Amino acid sequence: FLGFLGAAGSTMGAASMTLTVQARNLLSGIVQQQNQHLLQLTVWGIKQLQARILAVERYLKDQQLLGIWGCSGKLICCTTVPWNSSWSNRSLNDIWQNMTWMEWEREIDNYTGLIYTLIEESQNQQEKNEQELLELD
Amino acid sequence: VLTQSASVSGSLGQSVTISCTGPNSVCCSHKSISWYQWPPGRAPTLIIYEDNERAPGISPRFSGYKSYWSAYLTISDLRPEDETTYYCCSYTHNSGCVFGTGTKVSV
Numbered sequence: 174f175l176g177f178l179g180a181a182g183s184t185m186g187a188a189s190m191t192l193t194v195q196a197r198n199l200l201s202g203i204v205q206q207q208n209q210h211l212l213q214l215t216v217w218g219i220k221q222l223q224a225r226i227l228a229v230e231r232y233l234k235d236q237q238l239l240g241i242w243g244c245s246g247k248l249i250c251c252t253t254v255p256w257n258s259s260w261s262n263r264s265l266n267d268i269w270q271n272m273t274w275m276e277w278e279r280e281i282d283n284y285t286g287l288i289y290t291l292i293e294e295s296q297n298q299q300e301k302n303e304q305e306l307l308e309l310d
Numbered sequence: 311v312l313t314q315s316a317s318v319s320g321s322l323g324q325s326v327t328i329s330c331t332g333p334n335s336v337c338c339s340h341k342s343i344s345w346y347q348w349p350p351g352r353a354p355t356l357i358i359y360e361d362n363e364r365a366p367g368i369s370p371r372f373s374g375y376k377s378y379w380s381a382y383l384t385i386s387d388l389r390p391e392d393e394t395t396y397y398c399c400s401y402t403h404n405s406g407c408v409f410g411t412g413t414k415v416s417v
């Protein structure tokens with residue numbers, strides 16, 4: 174409803190305290206008819222439907238990444254992959270309080286794909302195998 | 311009111327220690343302490359803050375330790391550049407800095 178992007182440009186902590194606003198405003202349900210003209214020009218409705226489909230597809234791609242990372246039900250989840258100093262050398266206080274998520278994303282944008290493959294392969298695919306080998310008896 | 315060791319000396323490659331104590335009203339245990347490598351003419355460089363970790367870029371040679379009565383700044387692996395004046399500071403998150411008397415390190 175209200176407060177969307179309230180913590181944009183602020184410290185990373187203030188942004189990481191209000192992820193629920195972004196989460197609820199990612200998927201906007203159809204604004205219902207205020208009131209005849211439910212049948213409309215074909216050309217006009219083609220844009221809106223394609224936009225809704227693209228939004229739904231992006232949301233389900235993000236949820237698919239969540240599912241293959243084992244973080245489907247949570248907004249924040251810690252992982253087993255260690256940070257490699259290659260991607261960033263700054264410490265915790267240099268990141269969560271001094272910088273914003275914008276410049277941070279640009280800094281790790283090159284490595285974001287490399288981390289994604291790691292998050293998907295190194296941990297969860299070994300975790301499920303060790304869970305099957307652990308609960309096998 | 312914040313008193314340091316007026317001077318201190320250490321050999322090359324040794325670890326020197328600078329004391330920093332004060333009154334009960336301004337107690338080291340009550341607040342946080344930051345250290346500065348301050349050549350008097352030049353702009354000072356932050357070396358230690360919040361009594362923990364270090365300033366960004368500072369070598370792991372500098373170390374700090376805060377007792378309930380006095381603070382200590384330890385500079386391992388002494389260098390010719392370390393022969394400068396060092397100042398400690400008592401502060402909170404909303405009260406200004408309170409510098410000490412200063413300490414001149416000889417090598």
Ligand SMILES: *[C@@H]1O[C@H](CO)[C@@H](O[C@@H]2O[C@H](CO)[C@@H](O)[C@H](O)[C@H]2NC(C)=O)[C@H](O)[C@H]1NC(C)=O
Pocket residue numbers: 182183184270
């Ligand atoms: C960004 O906004 C924050 C506040 O949302 C600003 O930083 C705060 O400023 C107030 C007012 O002096 C202080 O009480 C806080 O302690 C400040 N927070 C921090 C973490 O320093 C900040 O100045 C704004 N600008 C930028 C570029 O971040």
Ligand SMILES: *[C@@H]1O[C@H](CO)[C@@H](O)[C@H](O)[C@H]1NC(C)=O
Pocket residue numbers: 255257258259
């Ligand atoms: C960190 O990056 C370097 C260089 O790319 C690589 O050689 C090393 O194996 C990496 N370490 C981990 C734990 O991924």
Ligand SMILES: *[C@@H]1O[C@H](CO)[C@@H](O)[C@H](O)[C@H]1NC(C)=O
Pocket residue numbers: 279280281283
């Ligand atoms: C990302 O890669 C580009 C080259 O494609 C390079 O110019 C840029 O400096 C890199 N940035 C970081 C933060 O690695």
